[PDB]
C-alpha cells in the first residue's frame, strides 16, 4: 500500500538547521505532491509547505525564508530542510500525501519525527528491572517492568518480547527530572505461573543516541 | 488566514452515546473542511473530507455535515476505540489551516486500581540512586492520591507521577508514582510504603516493603 | 488545551 517513512528523531542545537528525509512507496513522486506539516505545543498543527509532482514548491508564509524542500524521484525520497531553529520549533514534523495529486486532504501520513531544539547533549538511558515479587503479585497476576532512566531527548520506544507481548503493557509518559533528563517506566501484568516458564524482556530503543538495550526482567 | 474554532475543548460521553464536534470558521469556507482523528502516539487519520464525504476504511459511524462557517463531525454510537483528539482543517483559502482540536474522553464504571510496589534494583543502587516505583493499574476515574511514607515520615516533593492516556479497550487509566532518593538516604531507612486513595476503594490500600525483608 | 509531544495527545 501507500507508505511514508521518515528519518529518526533527534536533537538540533539552537540556530542550527533541521533535516528530515521522507521515503515513500506504493506511489511515485512524479504523480503526487508531498506535503510537510508540524505539530507543536504552542501552535498545534501547521502546514509548512509542499513539493509538487513537477518539482515546484510552495512554503507557508512565515517559513518562506528558512524552508527548503527537495526530492529525488528515482529514489522516492523527499528532503525537508529548515534553517535557524529556535526552541519553539520543537515539534513533531510529518510528511503527508493527499488523496488526489492537486489537493490537500491528507489521507497518508508519515509516522512523524519528534525534533527537539535544545542546547543540551544527547544521552542514552540506563534500563533497570522492575522485578515481580509477592508485593507485586495478587490473585495469580504478577506485575513487572523496566525503569528507563536519565535520557535526552524524547522519544524512547519500548516493546516487550520483541513485539510478541502487547497485552497488558503500559508504557508511561516520560517525565522531565530536575536534571533535565527524562525518565519513564514500562509495565506489564502476566500470570504469575508463567514467571518460571517465560522470559520477559523489555526492548528499549533511544534512536537519538543509537542506544538499544534488551533488559531481561526476573523474579528477585 | 482562516481561524478555525473547535468547541468545546473536551467532550466526555458514555459508550454507545452519540457525540458531535463543532468547528466554526472565521469566514465562510463553503464545504472545504476535512476532519482528522489522532489517537495516543499516532499521526492524524483522515475521517471525513469536504464536510460530508466518506473516506475508505473509516467506520460508518463517522459522519460530518455543515456549510458556510458552522461544521459538525458526528459519531452516532461512540466506542472506546474512539478515544482520541479530533481536528478540523479548512482549505477554501491558502494556506490550509487546522483547528485546535477537541478531546474525546469516555465514561465508564468505577474501577479500583490494582497496586504494586517495586523496590530499587541492585543494578540501579550501584549508580548511587534509588528509585521506588508504585504502580496503580487499570482504574477509573483518573483521580487518585499516592502518599509516600519512609519510616512513618511523610515524603514530599521527592516523587513524580505519570498517568497513561485512556486505554482504548477498557477505558481505564494506569498511574506510576516514582519516589527518588540518593543511595545514602535509601540505605539509612527500612520501611517504604505507598498509600493509594481512590473512589473505587473502600479504604486506602498500602503496599510496602522492608529494605531487605 | 495544549499538544503534548510525548503522547501526541491534547493535555487540558
PDB file of N, CA and C in Angstrom, chain A residues 22-121:
ATOM      1  N   UNK A  22      11.904  11.835   3.865  1.00  0.00           N
ATOM      2  CA  UNK A  22      10.651  11.101   3.740  1.00  0.00           C
ATOM      3  C   UNK A  22      10.800  10.169   2.553  1.00  0.00           C
ATOM      4  N   UNK A  23      10.758   8.864   2.814  1.00  0.00           N
ATOM      5  CA  UNK A  23      10.869   7.833   1.787  1.00  0.00           C
ATOM      6  C   UNK A  23       9.489   7.237   1.560  1.00  0.00           C
ATOM      7  N   UNK A  24       9.000   7.318   0.337  1.00  0.00           N
ATOM      8  CA  UNK A  24       7.643   6.905   0.041  1.00  0.00           C
ATOM      9  C   UNK A  24       7.687   5.601  -0.737  1.00  0.00           C
ATOM     10  N   UNK A  25       6.569   4.879  -0.702  1.00  0.00           N
ATOM     11  CA  UNK A  25       6.382   3.696  -1.531  1.00  0.00           C
ATOM     12  C   UNK A  25       4.893   3.498  -1.754  1.00  0.00           C
ATOM     13  N   UNK A  26       4.572   2.666  -2.745  1.00  0.00           N
ATOM     14  CA  UNK A  26       3.204   2.494  -3.184  1.00  0.00           C
ATOM     15  C   UNK A  26       2.681   3.610  -4.058  1.00  0.00           C
ATOM     16  N   UNK A  27       3.539   4.537  -4.468  1.00  0.00           N
ATOM     17  CA  UNK A  27       3.186   5.581  -5.423  1.00  0.00           C
ATOM     18  C   UNK A  27       4.489   6.261  -5.829  1.00  0.00           C
ATOM     19  N   UNK A  28       4.396   7.134  -6.823  1.00  0.00           N
ATOM     20  CA  UNK A  28       5.556   7.753  -7.444  1.00  0.00           C
ATOM     21  C   UNK A  28       5.506   9.258  -7.224  1.00  0.00           C
ATOM     22  N   UNK A  29       6.618   9.819  -6.749  1.00  0.00           N
ATOM     23  CA  UNK A  29       6.716  11.260  -6.540  1.00  0.00           C
ATOM     24  C   UNK A  29       6.487  12.047  -7.820  1.00  0.00           C
ATOM     25  N   UNK A  30       6.547  11.388  -8.980  1.00  0.00           N
ATOM     26  CA  UNK A  30       6.215  12.031 -10.241  1.00  0.00           C
ATOM     27  C   UNK A  30       4.714  12.204 -10.423  1.00  0.00           C
ATOM     28  N   UNK A  31       3.897  11.512  -9.620  1.00  0.00           N
ATOM     29  CA  UNK A  31       2.446  11.603  -9.714  1.00  0.00           C
ATOM     30  C   UNK A  31       1.786  12.320  -8.549  1.00  0.00           C
ATOM     31  N   UNK A  32       2.480  12.503  -7.432  1.00  0.00           N
ATOM     32  CA  UNK A  32       1.866  13.134  -6.277  1.00  0.00           C
ATOM     33  C   UNK A  32       2.821  14.132  -5.644  1.00  0.00           C
ATOM     34  N   UNK A  33       2.259  15.250  -5.176  1.00  0.00           N
ATOM     35  CA  UNK A  33       2.997  16.123  -4.291  1.00  0.00           C
ATOM     36  C   UNK A  33       3.111  15.545  -2.891  1.00  0.00           C
ATOM     37  N   UNK A  34       4.154  15.964  -2.173  1.00  0.00           N
ATOM     38  CA  UNK A  34       4.362  15.578  -0.780  1.00  0.00           C
ATOM     39  C   UNK A  34       4.364  16.842   0.067  1.00  0.00           C
ATOM     40  N   UNK A  35       3.513  16.864   1.092  1.00  0.00           N
ATOM     41  CA  UNK A  35       3.348  17.997   1.990  1.00  0.00           C
ATOM     42  C   UNK A  35       4.072  17.752   3.305  1.00  0.00           C
ATOM     43  N   UNK A  36       4.373  18.853   3.994  1.00  0.00           N
ATOM     44  CA  UNK A  36       5.009  18.825   5.302  1.00  0.00           C
ATOM     45  C   UNK A  36       4.158  19.608   6.289  1.00  0.00           C
ATOM     46  N   UNK A  37       3.876  18.970   7.425  1.00  0.00           N
ATOM     47  CA  UNK A  37       3.040  19.505   8.489  1.00  0.00           C
ATOM     48  C   UNK A  37       3.799  19.312   9.792  1.00  0.00           C
ATOM     49  N   UNK A  38       3.668  20.252  10.713  1.00  0.00           N
ATOM     50  CA  UNK A  38       4.271  20.054  12.017  1.00  0.00           C
ATOM     51  C   UNK A  38       3.206  20.231  13.089  1.00  0.00           C
ATOM     52  N   UNK A  39       3.512  19.721  14.280  1.00  0.00           N
ATOM     53  CA  UNK A  39       2.582  19.763  15.407  1.00  0.00           C
ATOM     54  C   UNK A  39       3.368  20.128  16.659  1.00  0.00           C
ATOM     55  N   UNK A  40       3.088  21.288  17.229  1.00  0.00           N
ATOM     56  CA  UNK A  40       3.848  21.791  18.361  1.00  0.00           C
ATOM     57  C   UNK A  40       2.908  22.096  19.513  1.00  0.00           C
ATOM     58  N   UNK A  41       3.436  22.224  20.734  1.00  0.00           N
ATOM     59  CA  UNK A  41       2.557  22.638  21.845  1.00  0.00           C
ATOM     60  C   UNK A  41       1.996  24.035  21.654  1.00  0.00           C
ATOM     61  N   UNK A  42       2.817  24.972  21.197  1.00  0.00           N
ATOM     62  CA  UNK A  42       2.363  26.350  21.118  1.00  0.00           C
ATOM     63  C   UNK A  42       1.358  26.594  20.009  1.00  0.00           C
ATOM     64  N   UNK A  43       1.598  26.025  18.825  1.00  0.00           N
ATOM     65  CA  UNK A  43       0.802  26.372  17.652  1.00  0.00           C
ATOM     66  C   UNK A  43       0.016  25.203  17.061  1.00  0.00           C
ATOM     67  N   UNK A  44       0.017  24.031  17.692  1.00  0.00           N
ATOM     68  CA  UNK A  44      -0.750  22.918  17.154  1.00  0.00           C
ATOM     69  C   UNK A  44      -0.298  22.539  15.757  1.00  0.00           C
ATOM     70  N   UNK A  45      -1.262  22.146  14.918  1.00  0.00           N
ATOM     71  CA  UNK A  45      -0.994  21.720  13.545  1.00  0.00           C
ATOM     72  C   UNK A  45      -0.798  22.930  12.626  1.00  0.00           C
ATOM     73  N   UNK A  46       0.354  22.971  11.961  1.00  0.00           N
ATOM     74  CA  UNK A  46       0.698  23.999  10.992  1.00  0.00           C
ATOM     75  C   UNK A  46       1.104  23.310   9.709  1.00  0.00           C
ATOM     76  N   UNK A  47       0.503  23.715   8.602  1.00  0.00           N
ATOM     77  CA  UNK A  47       1.005  23.299   7.309  1.00  0.00           C
ATOM     78  C   UNK A  47       2.232  24.141   6.974  1.00  0.00           C
ATOM     79  N   UNK A  48       3.326  23.479   6.611  1.00  0.00           N
ATOM     80  CA  UNK A  48       4.581  24.152   6.308  1.00  0.00           C
ATOM     81  C   UNK A  48       4.790  24.410   4.815  1.00  0.00           C
ATOM     82  N   UNK A  49       4.574  23.405   3.971  1.00  0.00           N
ATOM     83  CA  UNK A  49       4.781  23.550   2.542  1.00  0.00           C
ATOM     84  C   UNK A  49       4.610  22.224   1.829  1.00  0.00           C
ATOM     85  N   UNK A  50       4.925  22.250   0.536  1.00  0.00           N
ATOM     86  CA  UNK A  50       4.700  21.117  -0.351  1.00  0.00           C
ATOM     87  C   UNK A  50       5.704  21.190  -1.498  1.00  0.00           C
ATOM     88  N   UNK A  51       6.125  20.029  -1.986  1.00  0.00           N
ATOM     89  CA  UNK A  51       6.804  19.922  -3.270  1.00  0.00           C
ATOM     90  C   UNK A  51       5.905  19.112  -4.196  1.00  0.00           C
ATOM     91  N   UNK A  52       5.618  19.667  -5.374  1.00  0.00           N
ATOM     92  CA  UNK A  52       4.647  19.096  -6.301  1.00  0.00           C
ATOM     93  C   UNK A  52       5.306  18.072  -7.217  1.00  0.00           C
ATOM     94  N   UNK A  53       4.461  17.365  -7.977  1.00  0.00           N
ATOM     95  CA  UNK A  53       4.935  16.337  -8.908  1.00  0.00           C
ATOM     96  C   UNK A  53       6.082  16.840  -9.772  1.00  0.00           C
ATOM     97  N   UNK A  54       5.929  18.038 -10.340  1.00  0.00           N
ATOM     98  CA  UNK A  54       6.913  18.555 -11.273  1.00  0.00           C
ATOM     99  C   UNK A  54       8.004  19.408 -10.663  1.00  0.00           C
ATOM    100  N   UNK A  55       8.215  19.310  -9.343  1.00  0.00           N
ATOM    101  CA  UNK A  55       9.354  19.944  -8.700  1.00  0.00           C
ATOM    102  C   UNK A  55       9.118  21.317  -8.097  1.00  0.00           C
ATOM    103  N   UNK A  56       7.984  21.960  -8.374  1.00  0.00           N
ATOM    104  CA  UNK A  56       7.684  23.254  -7.776  1.00  0.00           C
ATOM    105  C   UNK A  56       7.398  23.120  -6.282  1.00  0.00           C
ATOM    106  N   UNK A  57       7.709  24.180  -5.543  1.00  0.00           N
ATOM    107  CA  UNK A  57       7.490  24.228  -4.106  1.00  0.00           C
ATOM    108  C   UNK A  57       6.619  25.423  -3.748  1.00  0.00           C
ATOM    109  N   UNK A  58       5.746  25.235  -2.764  1.00  0.00           N
ATOM    110  CA  UNK A  58       5.112  26.327  -2.037  1.00  0.00           C
ATOM    111  C   UNK A  58       5.484  26.202  -0.569  1.00  0.00           C
ATOM    112  N   UNK A  59       5.750  27.335   0.074  1.00  0.00           N
ATOM    113  CA  UNK A  59       6.037  27.383   1.500  1.00  0.00           C
ATOM    114  C   UNK A  59       5.033  28.294   2.194  1.00  0.00           C
ATOM    115  N   UNK A  60       4.539  27.861   3.359  1.00  0.00           N
ATOM    116  CA  UNK A  60       3.684  28.739   4.157  1.00  0.00           C
ATOM    117  C   UNK A  60       4.455  30.016   4.486  1.00  0.00           C
ATOM    118  N   UNK A  61       3.745  31.146   4.478  1.00  0.00           N
ATOM    119  CA  UNK A  61       4.364  32.475   4.523  1.00  0.00           C
ATOM    120  C   UNK A  61       5.441  32.671   5.592  1.00  0.00           C
ATOM    121  N   UNK A  62       5.215  32.375   6.880  1.00  0.00           N
ATOM    122  CA  UNK A  62       6.264  32.630   7.881  1.00  0.00           C
ATOM    123  C   UNK A  62       7.503  31.753   7.740  1.00  0.00           C
ATOM    124  N   UNK A  63       7.560  30.870   6.752  1.00  0.00           N
ATOM    125  CA  UNK A  63       8.664  29.945   6.598  1.00  0.00           C
ATOM    126  C   UNK A  63       9.371  30.086   5.260  1.00  0.00           C
ATOM    127  N   UNK A  64       8.951  31.031   4.410  1.00  0.00           N
ATOM    128  CA  UNK A  64       9.495  31.112   3.058  1.00  0.00           C
ATOM    129  C   UNK A  64      11.009  31.278   3.056  1.00  0.00           C
ATOM    130  N   UNK A  65      11.560  31.985   4.038  1.00  0.00           N
ATOM    131  CA  UNK A  65      12.978  32.334   4.025  1.00  0.00           C
ATOM    132  C   UNK A  65      13.861  31.374   4.813  1.00  0.00           C
ATOM    133  N   UNK A  66      13.304  30.349   5.447  1.00  0.00           N
ATOM    134  CA  UNK A  66      14.148  29.373   6.122  1.00  0.00           C
ATOM    135  C   UNK A  66      13.762  27.936   5.802  1.00  0.00           C
ATOM    136  N   UNK A  67      12.952  27.712   4.777  1.00  0.00           N
ATOM    137  CA  UNK A  67      12.459  26.387   4.443  1.00  0.00           C
ATOM    138  C   UNK A  67      12.901  26.006   3.036  1.00  0.00           C
ATOM    139  N   UNK A  68      13.375  24.775   2.875  1.00  0.00           N
ATOM    140  CA  UNK A  68      13.737  24.267   1.556  1.00  0.00           C
ATOM    141  C   UNK A  68      13.299  22.815   1.429  1.00  0.00           C
ATOM    142  N   UNK A  69      12.496  22.501   0.409  1.00  0.00           N
ATOM    143  CA  UNK A  69      12.054  21.133   0.143  1.00  0.00           C
ATOM    144  C   UNK A  69      12.597  20.693  -1.214  1.00  0.00           C
ATOM    145  N   UNK A  70      13.203  19.503  -1.253  1.00  0.00           N
ATOM    146  CA  UNK A  70      13.753  18.919  -2.470  1.00  0.00           C
ATOM    147  C   UNK A  70      13.448  17.428  -2.496  1.00  0.00           C
ATOM    148  N   UNK A  71      13.609  16.818  -3.670  1.00  0.00           N
ATOM    149  CA  UNK A  71      13.293  15.404  -3.787  1.00  0.00           C
ATOM    150  C   UNK A  71      14.137  14.743  -4.863  1.00  0.00           C
ATOM    151  N   UNK A  72      14.133  13.418  -4.815  1.00  0.00           N
ATOM    152  CA  UNK A  72      14.806  12.550  -5.772  1.00  0.00           C
ATOM    153  C   UNK A  72      13.756  11.531  -6.207  1.00  0.00           C
ATOM    154  N   UNK A  73      13.130  11.778  -7.364  1.00  0.00           N
ATOM    155  CA  UNK A  73      12.025  10.935  -7.829  1.00  0.00           C
ATOM    156  C   UNK A  73      12.431   9.472  -7.912  1.00  0.00           C
ATOM    157  N   UNK A  74      13.597   9.202  -8.502  1.00  0.00           N
ATOM    158  CA  UNK A  74      14.025   7.825  -8.726  1.00  0.00           C
ATOM    159  C   UNK A  74      14.177   7.069  -7.416  1.00  0.00           C
ATOM    160  N   UNK A  75      14.720   7.724  -6.391  1.00  0.00           N
ATOM    161  CA  UNK A  75      14.911   7.096  -5.092  1.00  0.00           C
ATOM    162  C   UNK A  75      13.693   7.229  -4.179  1.00  0.00           C
ATOM    163  N   UNK A  76      12.635   7.918  -4.623  1.00  0.00           N
ATOM    164  CA  UNK A  76      11.392   8.064  -3.856  1.00  0.00           C
ATOM    165  C   UNK A  76      11.633   8.770  -2.526  1.00  0.00           C
ATOM    166  N   UNK A  77      12.499   9.773  -2.530  1.00  0.00           N
ATOM    167  CA  UNK A  77      12.796  10.495  -1.307  1.00  0.00           C
ATOM    168  C   UNK A  77      12.444  11.962  -1.465  1.00  0.00           C
ATOM    169  N   UNK A  78      11.856  12.524  -0.413  1.00  0.00           N
ATOM    170  CA  UNK A  78      11.636  13.956  -0.279  1.00  0.00           C
ATOM    171  C   UNK A  78      12.498  14.449   0.874  1.00  0.00           C
ATOM    172  N   UNK A  79      13.150  15.598   0.687  1.00  0.00           N
ATOM    173  CA  UNK A  79      14.087  16.118   1.679  1.00  0.00           C
ATOM    174  C   UNK A  79      13.587  17.448   2.220  1.00  0.00           C
ATOM    175  N   UNK A  80      13.296  17.469   3.511  1.00  0.00           N
ATOM    176  CA  UNK A  80      12.878  18.666   4.223  1.00  0.00           C
ATOM    177  C   UNK A  80      14.089  19.231   4.958  1.00  0.00           C
ATOM    178  N   UNK A  81      14.341  20.524   4.771  1.00  0.00           N
ATOM    179  CA  UNK A  81      15.404  21.236   5.466  1.00  0.00           C
ATOM    180  C   UNK A  81      14.845  22.566   5.947  1.00  0.00           C
ATOM    181  N   UNK A  82      15.075  22.887   7.217  1.00  0.00           N
ATOM    182  CA  UNK A  82      14.644  24.165   7.763  1.00  0.00           C
ATOM    183  C   UNK A  82      15.787  24.770   8.575  1.00  0.00           C
ATOM    184  N   UNK A  83      16.072  26.054   8.335  1.00  0.00           N
ATOM    185  CA  UNK A  83      17.211  26.769   8.902  1.00  0.00           C
ATOM    186  C   UNK A  83      16.844  27.491  10.197  1.00  0.00           C
ATOM    187  N   UNK A  84      17.892  27.841  10.952  1.00  0.00           N
ATOM    188  CA  UNK A  84      17.860  28.663  12.159  1.00  0.00           C
ATOM    189  C   UNK A  84      16.702  28.332  13.098  1.00  0.00           C
ATOM    190  N   UNK A  85      16.739  27.146  13.705  1.00  0.00           N
ATOM    191  CA  UNK A  85      15.662  26.714  14.585  1.00  0.00           C
ATOM    192  C   UNK A  85      15.776  27.361  15.961  1.00  0.00           C
ATOM    193  N   UNK A  86      14.633  27.714  16.530  1.00  0.00           N
ATOM    194  CA  UNK A  86      14.546  28.183  17.905  1.00  0.00           C
ATOM    195  C   UNK A  86      13.828  27.130  18.741  1.00  0.00           C
ATOM    196  N   UNK A  87      13.730  27.387  20.044  1.00  0.00           N
ATOM    197  CA  UNK A  87      13.149  26.388  20.934  1.00  0.00           C
ATOM    198  C   UNK A  87      11.711  26.067  20.547  1.00  0.00           C
ATOM    199  N   UNK A  88      10.929  27.078  20.184  1.00  0.00           N
ATOM    200  CA  UNK A  88       9.547  26.800  19.825  1.00  0.00           C
ATOM    201  C   UNK A  88       9.417  26.119  18.461  1.00  0.00           C
ATOM    202  N   UNK A  89      10.514  25.849  17.759  1.00  0.00           N
ATOM    203  CA  UNK A  89      10.444  24.959  16.604  1.00  0.00           C
ATOM    204  C   UNK A  89      10.481  23.487  17.007  1.00  0.00           C
ATOM    205  N   UNK A  90      10.533  23.205  18.309  1.00  0.00           N
ATOM    206  CA  UNK A  90      10.374  21.852  18.826  1.00  0.00           C
ATOM    207  C   UNK A  90       8.966  21.358  18.531  1.00  0.00           C
ATOM    208  N   UNK A  91       8.858  20.232  17.827  1.00  0.00           N
ATOM    209  CA  UNK A  91       7.569  19.762  17.322  1.00  0.00           C
ATOM    210  C   UNK A  91       7.735  18.393  16.678  1.00  0.00           C
ATOM    211  N   UNK A  92       6.600  17.762  16.410  1.00  0.00           N
ATOM    212  CA  UNK A  92       6.563  16.588  15.549  1.00  0.00           C
ATOM    213  C   UNK A  92       6.386  17.071  14.118  1.00  0.00           C
ATOM    214  N   UNK A  93       7.337  16.722  13.265  1.00  0.00           N
ATOM    215  CA  UNK A  93       7.270  17.030  11.848  1.00  0.00           C
ATOM    216  C   UNK A  93       6.788  15.792  11.100  1.00  0.00           C
ATOM    217  N   UNK A  94       5.809  15.982  10.208  1.00  0.00           N
ATOM    218  CA  UNK A  94       5.281  14.915   9.370  1.00  0.00           C
ATOM    219  C   UNK A  94       5.396  15.284   7.900  1.00  0.00           C
ATOM    220  N   UNK A  95       5.641  14.267   7.067  1.00  0.00           N
ATOM    221  CA  UNK A  95       5.319  14.343   5.649  1.00  0.00           C
ATOM    222  C   UNK A  95       3.961  13.690   5.407  1.00  0.00           C
ATOM    223  N   UNK A  96       3.276  14.135   4.357  1.00  0.00           N
ATOM    224  CA  UNK A  96       1.936  13.631   4.096  1.00  0.00           C
ATOM    225  C   UNK A  96       1.630  13.705   2.610  1.00  0.00           C
ATOM    226  N   UNK A  97       0.683  12.867   2.184  1.00  0.00           N
ATOM    227  CA  UNK A  97       0.227  12.815   0.802  1.00  0.00           C
ATOM    228  C   UNK A  97      -1.290  12.922   0.749  1.00  0.00           C
ATOM    229  N   UNK A  98      -1.794  13.654  -0.238  1.00  0.00           N
ATOM    230  CA  UNK A  98      -3.226  13.870  -0.362  1.00  0.00           C
ATOM    231  C   UNK A  98      -3.871  12.708  -1.107  1.00  0.00           C
ATOM    232  N   UNK A  99      -5.209  12.696  -1.115  1.00  0.00           N
ATOM    233  CA  UNK A  99      -5.958  11.715  -1.906  1.00  0.00           C
ATOM    234  C   UNK A  99      -5.718  11.885  -3.407  1.00  0.00           C
ATOM    235  N   UNK A 100      -5.833  13.108  -3.915  1.00  0.00           N
ATOM    236  CA  UNK A 100      -5.562  13.377  -5.320  1.00  0.00           C
ATOM    237  C   UNK A 100      -4.303  14.217  -5.439  1.00  0.00           C
ATOM    238  N   UNK A 101      -3.772  14.268  -6.660  1.00  0.00           N
ATOM    239  CA  UNK A 101      -2.451  14.838  -6.900  1.00  0.00           C
ATOM    240  C   UNK A 101      -2.379  16.341  -6.636  1.00  0.00           C
ATOM    241  N   UNK A 102      -3.504  17.060  -6.690  1.00  0.00           N
ATOM    242  CA  UNK A 102      -3.501  18.516  -6.583  1.00  0.00           C
ATOM    243  C   UNK A 102      -4.058  19.030  -5.261  1.00  0.00           C
ATOM    244  N   UNK A 103      -4.550  18.155  -4.393  1.00  0.00           N
ATOM    245  CA  UNK A 103      -5.428  18.543  -3.300  1.00  0.00           C
ATOM    246  C   UNK A 103      -4.672  18.528  -1.960  1.00  0.00           C
ATOM    247  N   UNK A 104      -5.417  18.721  -0.866  1.00  0.00           N
ATOM    248  CA  UNK A 104      -4.829  18.909   0.455  1.00  0.00           C
ATOM    249  C   UNK A 104      -5.556  18.106   1.526  1.00  0.00           C
ATOM    250  N   UNK A 105      -6.370  17.121   1.149  1.00  0.00           N
ATOM    251  CA  UNK A 105      -6.998  16.244   2.131  1.00  0.00           C
ATOM    252  C   UNK A 105      -6.028  15.085   2.360  1.00  0.00           C
ATOM    253  N   UNK A 106      -5.341  15.117   3.507  1.00  0.00           N
ATOM    254  CA  UNK A 106      -4.161  14.284   3.754  1.00  0.00           C
ATOM    255  C   UNK A 106      -4.567  12.893   4.236  1.00  0.00           C
ATOM    256  N   UNK A 107      -4.644  11.957   3.290  1.00  0.00           N
ATOM    257  CA  UNK A 107      -5.033  10.587   3.585  1.00  0.00           C
ATOM    258  C   UNK A 107      -3.861   9.692   3.973  1.00  0.00           C
ATOM    259  N   UNK A 108      -2.623  10.109   3.749  1.00  0.00           N
ATOM    260  CA  UNK A 108      -1.476   9.298   4.130  1.00  0.00           C
ATOM    261  C   UNK A 108      -0.482  10.164   4.881  1.00  0.00           C
ATOM    262  N   UNK A 109      -0.055   9.690   6.045  1.00  0.00           N
ATOM    263  CA  UNK A 109       0.897  10.406   6.882  1.00  0.00           C
ATOM    264  C   UNK A 109       2.121   9.551   7.162  1.00  0.00           C
ATOM    265  N   UNK A 110       3.273  10.199   7.247  1.00  0.00           N
ATOM    266  CA  UNK A 110       4.426   9.570   7.851  1.00  0.00           C
ATOM    267  C   UNK A 110       4.223   9.416   9.347  1.00  0.00           C
ATOM    268  N   UNK A 111       5.122   8.659   9.968  1.00  0.00           N
ATOM    269  CA  UNK A 111       4.962   8.357  11.383  1.00  0.00           C
ATOM    270  C   UNK A 111       5.342   9.528  12.278  1.00  0.00           C
ATOM    271  N   UNK A 112       5.784  10.643  11.703  1.00  0.00           N
ATOM    272  CA  UNK A 112       6.195  11.801  12.478  1.00  0.00           C
ATOM    273  C   UNK A 112       7.633  11.711  12.949  1.00  0.00           C
ATOM    274  N   UNK A 113       8.346  12.835  12.980  1.00  0.00           N
ATOM    275  CA  UNK A 113       9.686  12.910  13.547  1.00  0.00           C
ATOM    276  C   UNK A 113       9.676  13.951  14.655  1.00  0.00           C
ATOM    277  N   UNK A 114       9.917  13.513  15.895  1.00  0.00           N
ATOM    278  CA  UNK A 114       9.992  14.440  17.023  1.00  0.00           C
ATOM    279  C   UNK A 114      11.348  15.125  17.008  1.00  0.00           C
ATOM    280  N   UNK A 115      11.342  16.432  16.810  1.00  0.00           N
ATOM    281  CA  UNK A 115      12.564  17.210  16.771  1.00  0.00           C
ATOM    282  C   UNK A 115      12.588  18.087  18.007  1.00  0.00           C
ATOM    283  N   UNK A 116      13.693  18.020  18.743  1.00  0.00           N
ATOM    284  CA  UNK A 116      13.887  18.795  19.954  1.00  0.00           C
ATOM    285  C   UNK A 116      14.959  19.837  19.659  1.00  0.00           C
ATOM    286  N   UNK A 117      14.621  21.109  19.832  1.00  0.00           N
ATOM    287  CA  UNK A 117      15.598  22.182  19.715  1.00  0.00           C
ATOM    288  C   UNK A 117      16.074  22.519  21.115  1.00  0.00           C
ATOM    289  N   UNK A 118      17.360  22.293  21.361  1.00  0.00           N
ATOM    290  CA  UNK A 118      17.916  22.459  22.692  1.00  0.00           C
ATOM    291  C   UNK A 118      19.426  22.508  22.584  1.00  0.00           C
ATOM    292  N   UNK A 119      20.039  23.191  23.543  1.00  0.00           N
ATOM    293  CA  UNK A 119      21.483  23.314  23.573  1.00  0.00           C
ATOM    294  C   UNK A 119      22.161  22.142  24.276  1.00  0.00           C
ATOM    295  N   UNK A 120      21.388  21.247  24.893  1.00  0.00           N
ATOM    296  CA  UNK A 120      21.946  20.156  25.675  1.00  0.00           C
ATOM    297  C   UNK A 120      22.559  19.097  24.766  1.00  0.00           C
ATOM    298  N   UNK A 121      23.011  18.018  25.390  1.00  0.00           N
ATOM    299  CA  UNK A 121      23.642  16.906  24.701  1.00  0.00           C
ATOM    300  C   UNK A 121      22.725  15.688  24.734  1.00  0.00           C
TER     301      UNK A 121
END
